[PDB]
Amino acid sequence: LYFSRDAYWEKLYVDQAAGTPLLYVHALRDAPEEVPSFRLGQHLYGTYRTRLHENNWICIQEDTGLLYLNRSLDHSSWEKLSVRNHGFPLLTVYLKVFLSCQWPGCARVYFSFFNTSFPACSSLKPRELCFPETRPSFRIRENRPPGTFHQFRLLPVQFLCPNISVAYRLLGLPFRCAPDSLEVSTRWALDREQREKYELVAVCTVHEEVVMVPFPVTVYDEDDSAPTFPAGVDTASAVVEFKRKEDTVVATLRVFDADVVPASGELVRRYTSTLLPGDTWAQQTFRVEHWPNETSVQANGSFVRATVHDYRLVLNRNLSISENRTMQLAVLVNDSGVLLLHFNVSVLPVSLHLPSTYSLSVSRRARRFAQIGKVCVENCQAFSGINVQYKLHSSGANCSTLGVVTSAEDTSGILFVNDTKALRRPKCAELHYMVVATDQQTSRQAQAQLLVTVEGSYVAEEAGCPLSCAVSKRRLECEECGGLGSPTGRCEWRQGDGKGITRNFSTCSPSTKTCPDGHCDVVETQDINICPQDCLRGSIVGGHEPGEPRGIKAGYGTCNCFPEEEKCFCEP
Amino acid sequence: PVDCVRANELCAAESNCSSRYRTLRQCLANKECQAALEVLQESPLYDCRCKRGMKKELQCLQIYWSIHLGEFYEASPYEPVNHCLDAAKACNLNDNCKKLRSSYISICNREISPTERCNRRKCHKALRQFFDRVPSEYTYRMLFCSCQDQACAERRRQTILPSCSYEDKEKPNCLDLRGVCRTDHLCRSRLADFHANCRASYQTVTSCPADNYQACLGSYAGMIGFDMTPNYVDSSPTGIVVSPWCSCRGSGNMEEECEKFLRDFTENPCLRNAIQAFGN
Ligand SMILES: *[C@@H]1O[C@H](CO)[C@@H](O)[C@H](O)[C@H]1NC(C)=O
Ligand SMILES: *[C@@H]1O[C@H](CO)[C@@H](O)[C@H](O)[C@H]1NC(C)=O
Ligand SMILES: *[C@@H]1O[C@H](CO)[C@@H](O)[C@H](O)[C@H]1NC(C)=O
Ligand SMILES: *[C@@H]1O[C@H](CO)[C@@H](O)[C@H](O)[C@H]1NC(C)=O
Ligand SMILES: *[C@@H]1O[C@H](CO)[C@@H](O)[C@H](O)[C@H]1NC(C)=O
Ligand SMILES: *[C@@H]1O[C@H](CO)[C@@H](O)[C@H](O)[C@H]1NC(C)=O
Ligand SMILES: [Ca+2]
Ligand SMILES: [Ca+2]
Ligand SMILES: [Ca+2]
Ligand SMILES: [Ca+2]
Numbered sequence: 001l002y003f004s005r006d007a008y009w010e011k012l013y014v015d016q017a018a019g020t021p022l023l024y025v026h027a028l029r030d031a032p033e034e035v036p037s038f039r040l041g042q043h044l045y046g047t048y049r050t051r052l053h054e055n056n057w058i059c060i061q062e063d064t065g066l067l068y069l070n071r072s073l074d075h076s077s078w079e080k081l082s083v084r085n086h087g088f089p090l091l092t093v094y095l096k097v098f099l100s101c102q103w104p105g106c107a108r109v110y111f112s113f114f115n116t117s118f119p120a121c122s123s124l125k126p127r128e129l130c131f132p133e134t135r136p137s138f139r140i141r142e143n144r145p146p147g148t149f150h151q152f153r154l155l156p157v158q159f160l161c162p163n164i165s166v167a168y169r170l171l172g173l174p175f176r177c178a179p180d181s182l183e184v185s186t187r188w189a190l191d192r193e194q195r196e197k198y199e200l201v202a203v204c205t206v207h208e209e210v211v212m213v214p215f216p217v218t219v220y221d222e223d224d225s226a227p228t229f230p231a232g233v234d235t236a237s238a239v240v241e242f243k244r245k246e247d248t249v250v251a252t253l254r255v256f257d258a259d260v261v262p263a264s265g266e267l268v269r270r271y272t273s274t275l276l277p278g279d280t281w282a283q284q285t286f287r288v289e290h291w292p293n294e295t296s297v298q299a300n301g302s303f304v305r306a307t308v309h310d311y312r313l314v315l316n317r318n319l320s321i322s323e324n325r326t327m328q329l330a331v332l333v334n335d336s337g338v339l340l341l342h343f344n345v346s347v348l349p350v351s352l353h354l355p356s357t358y359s360l361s362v363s364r365r366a367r368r369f370a371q372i373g374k375v376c377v378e379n380c381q382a383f384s385g386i387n388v389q390y391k392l393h394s395s396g397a398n399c400s401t402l403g404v405v406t407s408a409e410d411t412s413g414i415l416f417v418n419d420t421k422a423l424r425r426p427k428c429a430e431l432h433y434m435v436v437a438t439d440q441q442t443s444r445q446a447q448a449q450l451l452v453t454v455e456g457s458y459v460a461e462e463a464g465c466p467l468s469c470a471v472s473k474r475r476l477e478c479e480e481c482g483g484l485g486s487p488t489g490r491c492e493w494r495q496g497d498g499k500g501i502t503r504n505f506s507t508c509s510p511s512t513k514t515c516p517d518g519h520c521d522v523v524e525t526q527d528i529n530i531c532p533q534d535c536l537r538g539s540i541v542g543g544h545e546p547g548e549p550r551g552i553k554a555g556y557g558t559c560n561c562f563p564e565e566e567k568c569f570c571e572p
Numbered sequence: 573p574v575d576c577v578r579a580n581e582l583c584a585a586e587s588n589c590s591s592r593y594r595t596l597r598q599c600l601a602n603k604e605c606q607a608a609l610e611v612l613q614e615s616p617l618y619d620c621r622c623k624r625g626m627k628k629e630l631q632c633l634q635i636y637w638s639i640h641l642g643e644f645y646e647a648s649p650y651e652p653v654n655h656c657l658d659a660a661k662a663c664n665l666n667d668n669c670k671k672l673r674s675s676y677i678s679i680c681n682r683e684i685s686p687t688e689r690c691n692r693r694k695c696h697k698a699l700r701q702f703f704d705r706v707p708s709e710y711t712y713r714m715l716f717c718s719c720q721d722q723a724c725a726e727r728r729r730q731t732i733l734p735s736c737s738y739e740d741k742e743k744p745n746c747l748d749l750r751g752v753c754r755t756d757h758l759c760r761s762r763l764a765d766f767h768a769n770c771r772a773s774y775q776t777v778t779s780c781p782a783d784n785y786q787a788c789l790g791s792y793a794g795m796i797g798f799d800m801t802p803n804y805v806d807s808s809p810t811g812i813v814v815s816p817w818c819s820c821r822g823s824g825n826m827e828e829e830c831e832k833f834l835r836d837f838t839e840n841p842c843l844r845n846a847i848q849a850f851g852n
């Protein structure tokens with residue numbers, strides 16, 4: 001038992017006599033034992049869940065399902081009931097109907113009342129003689145014994161105007177309009193899994209006007225579909241090799257289901273994924289994430305929808321390097337039909353050796369905090385959740401000149417000039433360092449050779465030089481003076497364009513590959529005089545756009561910066 | 573007309589009314605409920621409203637939803653009352669519109685991370701503070717300005733800055749977003765305010781109740797800055813369809829109610845005719 005709709009519609013007037021039939025109802029059964037009873041709610045509901053009075057004018061026939069008028073109407077009862085609307089205009093009342101307020105356990109019936117009386121038969125258009133204002137829309141389960149769910153006629157219309165010749169007509173369809181009785185029935189039991197929608201055109205014919213009205217039919221679903229693989233895939237092989245992060249999607253698969261019925265409120269409570277136990281290392285390092293998505297599939301030239309569940313497999317912690325294992329994981333799927341999944345996971349350890357000797361040089365004219373070379377593992381861009389730190393050990397322990405800091409983006413170290421005087425000495429000209437590549441989580445480490453040659457000559461800078469490269473504004477004063485961060489000893493000039501506010505802003509940097517890079521690395525952020533145009537937290541004078549954590553993202557004209565006041569200027 | 577703040581004022585001045593109010597509040601938050609109901613149907617708390625932009629609107633709504641008994645429509649607790657270039661120029665020549673305009677822009681145009689595009693709650697707070705205390709001849713002129721080409725429609729779409737507030741990574745279910753909006757006090761009251769003033773009608777000539785364009789426009793613009801915050805769908809010059817950031821997917825057997833809930837924003841002749849007649 002279920003109501004075919006949730007809203008029936010009826011127009012009322014003043015002084016309609018008793019015994020006037022109002023409307024029909026329909027309640028299609030589910031089992032061959034069910035008889036539709038119809039009981040009425042004992043309150044004339046007004047607007048927004050407000051009781052007005054008990055029903056005392058409308059009675060019902062439970063057998064034919066006939067709402068009709070028990071008593072007559074007047075102006076006095078309706079002006080009485082309009083008072084209790086509490087500041088709202090009386091436009092539509094409604095009743096509640098039980099059967100054995102929500103569909104399908106209850107059905108509310110609307111009544112749109114007019115303060116005027118019943119107009120004449122010829123004073124009404126046949127569009128207002130055939131069908132109501134609210135075009136219907138029905139709710140039908142799948143795979144149920146069909147019956148009668150709708151009737152066409154307007155009962156007070158033909159009850160008060162019987163002399164108007166009116167016909168109704170429907171156009172391999174299971175639906176049918178019977179002759180000599182304008183009830184609508186359905187031949188066979190239907191399924192949404194074949195087709196979900198049935199829109200039709202019902203034709204009313206008066207004397208003379210032919211009126212076409214749309215007629216939608218919606219089919220509802222039951223859980224008639226076990227979970228199904230797309231094509232035979234039951235397992236998924238994956239290797240946890242380089243990432244080892246707290247959370248990375250390891251394995252991914254799809255499962256088809258034509259059942260839609262466990263919707264998003266109760267979707268967690270019905271479609272169950274269960275990691276089968278057996279090792280505590282899996283339960284401390286793995287989990288299964290699950291969500292569906294609706295897709296549209298074709299059945300007989302139509303487009304119905306179904307659920308494609310996606311099961312992915314997620315890590316739980318930072319896996320260390322020393323893991324040298326493999327497992328098979330088993331997954332239960334419950335579509336409350338019972339499905340099993342597998343995952344061959346292989347967690348392979350990582351070698352941490354380096355090339356043994358990093359032969360390189362450095363010019364003598366360089367200044368403090370100038371980048372030279374890069375120390376890194378053979379797989380630089382493979383590490384995700386493993387911290388690798390770099391240090392130095394000078395051999396003579398007397399000629400300390402250089403240092404290494406580690407960026408955790410690439411997990412790699414960058415050489416920087418720490419001292420000027422030790423590089424300035426002709427004694428410490430070829431230096432031998434033990435670059436030791438360490439680790440934080442598990443103390444596996446390695447080491448390597450660093451030979452560096454102090455090469456070139458030394459020339460003093462100018463008399464009025466500032467301490468940073470970005471103080472200069474023109475091109476000549478940039479390269480004829482030496483700032484801090486450059487390993488060349490002089491500052492470099494990059495020249496932009498006249499295309500307005502661009503990223504290509506003309507400036508003076510230490511290195512044209514490092515300072516206007518758009519990234520503030522570990523080297524530049526040590527002391528804020530090196531690269532102010534990538535690492536400042538300050539104010540900008542001129543049309544520009546600042547960087548996303550910090551810095552100048554785009555400028556106009558020439559851009560110089562005073563890092564002593566955290567101020568920058570941009571002007572052609 | 574007694575608002576719920578003064579209704580609580582007259583409620584706290586009496587002993588029986590306060591007793592039945594706290595009794596029904598302990599009931600909701602048989603016979604104890606029904607006696608309190610049949611007493612408090614004559615209270616000043618009964619049929620108390622609130623105001624738009626009033627001081628302590630939150631307490632008024634928390635009092636009003638406290639007496640409410642536990643559904644597509646609900647009762648509104650309120651008083652039932654180049655062109656876009658010129659709109660922005662008329663804003664920036666006044667001082668009150670300029671300050672709050674630059675306030676919500678400089679809040680909502682601040683990217684934090686490459687993942688987090690903007691901060692959500694501060695942007696909504698700035699947009700609510702903009703659309704509460706600005707005179708409505710400035711808000712309606714900038715949000716509703718008649719266009720003929722694509723660039724004007726793009727400026728009109730970018731006015732509430734949808735890159736931070738409106739769009740998200742996904743379009744969730746409209747029914748779930750309705751449940752989230754009806755969980756909160758303020759969003760549920762603004763949604764009931766929109767439902768009471770912007771339904772379609774078969775009797776009135778403009779399909780709007782009381783033929784009131786102003787109440788439907790105020791009920792529209794009062795939803796800005798919540799999770800159910802609508803905007804335009806594209807940069808169409810003449811085609812004007814507003815929509816919240818959701819869709820009909822994931823509906824299950826609740827598809828028809830989701831479509832009917834979405835047709836309030838997509839296919840409302842009342843709201844579209846109100847926008848068109850305001851544009852004339
Ligand atoms: C679901 O599938 C549609 C297909 O176009 C896609 O756009 C959407 O991102 C998918 N959503 C999820 C959560 O997978
Ligand atoms: C991992 O274990 C296997 C077991 O035979 C061994 O052969 C292999 O050398 C181990 N991995 C490393 C990096 O030592
Ligand atoms: C699936 O869930 C239902 C609901 O609790 C339960 O009765 C059934 O036993 C479950 N399936 C399995 C294989 O346990
Ligand atoms: C997963 O491991 C099992 C264990 O023998 C094996 O039979 C199966 O073929 C493996 N899966 C794949 C895709 O090779
Ligand atoms: C995992 O490693 C990352 C790498 O930096 C680290 O930031 C994070 O705190 C680690 N988390 C855990 C739970 O170990
Ligand atoms: C650079 O030199 C200073 C002073 O000699 C010292 O404190 C600092 O630790 C050095 N840098 C590194 C990375 O060792
Ligand atoms: Ca079926
Ligand atoms: Ca299923
Ligand atoms: Ca199904
Ligand atoms: Ca840089």
